[model samples]
Every structure is written in C-alpha cells, then in structure tokens.
Target: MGSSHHHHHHSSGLVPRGSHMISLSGLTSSVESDLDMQQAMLTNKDEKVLKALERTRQLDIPDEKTMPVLMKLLEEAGGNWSYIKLDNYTALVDAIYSVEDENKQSEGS
Candidate 1:
C-alpha cells in the first residue's frame, strides 16, 4: 500500500487499485468543473486510472471493447493533454491499459 511496487503491480496501466477509484471519479468531476484539479490530483500513475475511468463513465467500456477506443483516445489525448507532465501522460495511460486484458478476464468470471 505504501511502496511503488504495490502500486505498480496492481497498476497495469489503465486502472490503479480500487482505493484510488473515488479519487479518479473526483478528478473527472474536477476536470469538468470550473475549479482547479491540478492541486488535488494525484501523480501520473493514479491520473491514468482517472483518465480512463472518466471516459468509461461517459462512453461505457465493455472489457472486450475498450482497447481500440482507449488507443484512439489515448493517442489523441497523448498528442497533447499534459500541461505540466506531457511525457508522463502516455506512460500513465499505457500503465492503466496494461490491466485491460486482465480486467476483461476478471469481469467475465
């Protein structure tokens, strides 16, 4: 819970642990809000989950049907999303997407 390894192991890329999920949602809200989320937001790792989760909430991702959509969106968003940490943006999305296959499998069973 404290180490980066714990975060990395579960981080697969598109999702962080369930613990940060609420924060992800909150970020999405703030992203849409007039207020600033930059201060309240977590690191790129957690932001990855929040990013994907935000899209999922709006677009609805079926485990089998999220990758291409993610790819396209990530590609587009990655082109220019980060105002401060541009380089880290893709890595974060990639990290979260890493769990997509596993999530797909898990969701079915």
Candidate 2:
C-alpha cells in the first residue's frame, strides 16, 4: 500500500462531444447545492477559471506550470471559460434588480 499513488482530478473541464455543463464557481451556493443538480453542475462549469486560479496558487506566473496551461486551455475554449465570480453579487443583483425590474415594468405597462 505504501507504493500506491492516488490520482485525483478535482476539476477537469473536459466535455465530450456536444455535452454541455455549467461551471461550478459561477453557480450560487444554493443553486450549486441543489439536490437535483446535474453531475457537472456542482463542479467547475469550465476549467479556465479553476486553472488560472490554480496557476497563481501552486506556482509563479508566465510559467509552464499552472497559469500557462490554464491560459492555453482558456484560449482554446474561448468564451467557454468565463472567469467570473458569483459570490454575493449574484444574489444581490438577481434578487434585487431583475425581479423588481420585471415587476415594475409590468405595472408600468
């Protein structure tokens, strides 16, 4: 058992042929934690954000370790890898503005 090496892949943004999955970080906690969420829903929707952040963490920038690989993948996927954070902003904005906007607009009309 001492010679056994565990291979753990936390976030791999590999989508097989026509398969679509949303990124995890971009999802709200509640939404991400939804009991009925898809397999990929609760994890990284895409890999770029994870890779970029990972790069900055485990190594220096502009190197072939983390950031470079992450960026390269990001470029390959293009907008498929959206580096955004929902945080409190998702709740703040969606719960505050869009709902009210819809309601007020409906009343006005």
Candidate 3:
C-alpha cells in the first residue's frame, strides 16, 4: 500500500511577571519636654551630671532612664552630687525603681 506523509504542529506560550514597590516617610520630629530637658542637661558641661551618668552606666542603667531621676534628685538636694552619689547611689537607685514601678502601673492601666 502506498504511504502518505502527514504534518502536524502545536504551539504553547507562557509568561510570568511580578513587581513590588514601597514608599516611606515621616520618621522624625516628636520633640517633647523630657527630651528638651535632657538636651539642656547635656548642653551644660556639669561635672556632677556627667559623673552621675557615668555611675549609672556602670550600674547598667541607660542615661535616658537615669536623667529624670537624676534631675529630680539634684533639685531635691539643691544640686548636690554628694547626696546623690552617697551610699553607692542608693537614693538614685531607689528613686529610679520607684519611677519605674509607677510607670509600669500607669501603663498597665
């Protein structure tokens, strides 16, 4: 039997595309009184303030956490570093903890 040739063709197409975009802004400028006070404290080259911050650093407390209590202690003691630095900074430590607890309670509520 005579043979005949036949031709057939098939085609397939596929494409993939993707894109991601992100824009961000407004991450600065929330100046408050606490920060202003800290800046003021730092601006003046006070030996006692620097020493107090150093002592707190040695005790593993950050300056930001130390400043408010330190300022209050200074005011109460009439700017006397002796009282704040005495007894291994007992007054400062106690006041720091006191403020910390007060903040914790306020935050919890």
Candidate 4:
C-alpha cells in the first residue's frame, strides 16, 4: 500500500456555520511565549481603555493572505494608499496652535 493522495473539498460539516472555534495548536515555542507576553500587556492596560476597545470591536485585524482586500476598503475611505501628495499645512498648524494654547491656558489656571 503506497498510495499518497488526498481529495480537496468544500465540506461545510468540517467546520459548520456558527461554530467559531479557533485552534492555536502546534505553534513554535517562541510564538507561544510571545502570545503569553501579549496577554500580560492586555491584562495590564487600564480598564476603561480595555472596555472602550472592546466596545469598538475592530481589534482583530486579520493576518491572512487576503489582507489586500482590507487595504482596498481603507483606500476607498480616503486612507493612504497612493503615495506622496501635498500636505494640509493650515489644519496642521491650527491643531498645533490649539494644543499649545491648551498647555498655556492650563499653566495659567
């Protein structure tokens, strides 16, 4: 018996709809240790910030081959896709002035 062939399929029963179980099995020790550190960082964050991030619920940016689709969506919404355009100096200066003003005002108070 020397047969080595496997059939590819679109089997829904393999991972049925509404079953969102994630597997983190068989990862490198370095990666597993990194995940432990990341978990600690999250646990150490301020409770309010944690709650706010959870409320927004856009935390999980996928690390997959299909990430180009995500980039296209961001580009559609005026995100930086195309390189090198003229800067908005007026708004930048205004924002800088506002922060400086706030600092000056807080000092006086």
Candidate 5:
C-alpha cells in the first residue's frame, strides 16, 4: 500500500471502471441488418407474396378464415405491380387472382 494507486482512466463513465469495454460493433450490426430487411420489404413485392403464400400453406386457412388472408394478398399486390410479369409465375398470378375472388365473395356476403 505504499504510494501506488491503480486507477483505471479509460472508462467514459457509462460503464464501471474495472470491467472490460463492451463493444458497440454488435449493436451497430444489428441495426444495420434491420435496416437492410426493411429496405428489402419496402422494395420487393415478390417476397411479400411469397411470404403470404408460405403462411397460407402453413395454416390451411378455412373458407371462413381465408377472407382476411386473401385480403392481405390483394393489398400487398395492389400496392405495387412492379413484379407483375407473366413470364414465369403464371401459377402464382393465378393464385393471387383466386385469392382476389375469395376476397370478392367475402365482400359480397
């Protein structure tokens, strides 16, 4: 205990002095990844329809249950026709139109 003090000076006071520094790299990466996901969602209709289709497949929604789900599909497709080319996804387009019919029947009821 002779005139030698061990005081850590690197801390910016947001953390305790004796602990290791918690790097912000992981936090930054998480935020950047979230931003990338939002960008993909905002810019792509194919993905939204694919996700809705996947959900539909997973839950075998009943006729009474399908109206809301089909409405969602129409809403997603109506937002942007950017992905509407009849070159490859004839089946998917047909599926969406069928869902639209379901939506219409639901509305007429």
Candidate 6:
C-alpha cells in the first residue's frame, strides 16, 4: 500500500495598523511648545470647547479631527469660543470641509 501527503495554505489580505514611536527632540520644541501652549489656553476654556467637540462628535466628527480646526478658529477668532460655537458650530464644520477640500486637491495633483 502507498500513502500520499498533501499541504494546504491560505493567505489573508489584511494589513495591521502600524504604530511607530517618534522621539521629540529639541529641534521640534518650537512647534511642540506652541501646540502645548494653545492646548493649555484651550483647557481654560474647556467648557465651551468641550461643548463644541461634543456637538461635532454627534455629527460623526471625532475630537482628533475637530481639534485642528478648533485651534485655528480659536486663534483667528481671538480665542473666542462664540465664533466657533455660533450657529451650531457651523464655523468649525465649514473649516473641516475646507480642509478636506484642500487635502483632496493636494492628493489629486
């Protein structure tokens, strides 16, 4: 009697999320500190900003996506939460849409 052996293999097409650690050296301190300072200032106005973040979250926009535009609006509006919270956070929504358009343009080119 004779016996035969067989092998089977399958490949899954899935990519894992890559997590890389980046060191923040002094050369990056200038921009780092600027963001830190802005965050600190925002904390002082957390109540209003939190409300805005929550509102955006309800619209399916997460905090990470909203913060950049929030910071920009804060600076341009002289740290006035009113401008961002005005008209149901339309300013923030508009800014986010504007950034998305810019991203599309850059990628398109």
TM-score of each: 0.23, 0.19, 0.51, 0.21, 0.19, 0.47
Candidate 1 yields a Cα-based lDDT of 0.45
Stretches of candidate 6 above 4 Å error? 1-47, 101-109
lDDT (tens digit, per residue) of candidate 1 on 27-52: 35534433433533432333454554
> What's the lDDT for candidate 4?
0.36
Instruction: After the best TM-score superposition of candidate 6, give how far the Cα of residue 17 lies from its true spot, in angstroms.
Output: 17
Clash count (model 1, backbone only):
7
* Model 2 lDDT at residue 95: 30
Lowest lDDT block of 10, candidate 6: 100-109
Tens-place lDDT digits, model 3, residues 1-107: 99999997886767887874333333455433435676766545456677777767776786767876687777888987776677777776787666656543555
TM-score, prediction 6: 0.47
Q: lDDT, candidate 3, residue 100? A: 59
Model 2, global lDDT: 0.41
Best by TM-score: 3
lDDT of each: 0.45, 0.41, 0.68, 0.36, 0.47, 0.68
Pairs in steric clash, model 2: 22-45, 23-45, 24-45
Model 3, runs deviating above 4 Å: 1-45, 102-104, 107-109
lDDT of 4 by residue, 84-103 (tens): 11332222233333443453
Runs in model 5 deviating more than 4 A are: 1-60, 79-109
Q: After superposition, how far is residue 73 of candidate 6 from its true place, in Å?
A: 1.2
lDDT of 6: 0.68
* Residue 109 Cα positional deviation in candidate 5, in Å, after optimal superposition: 22
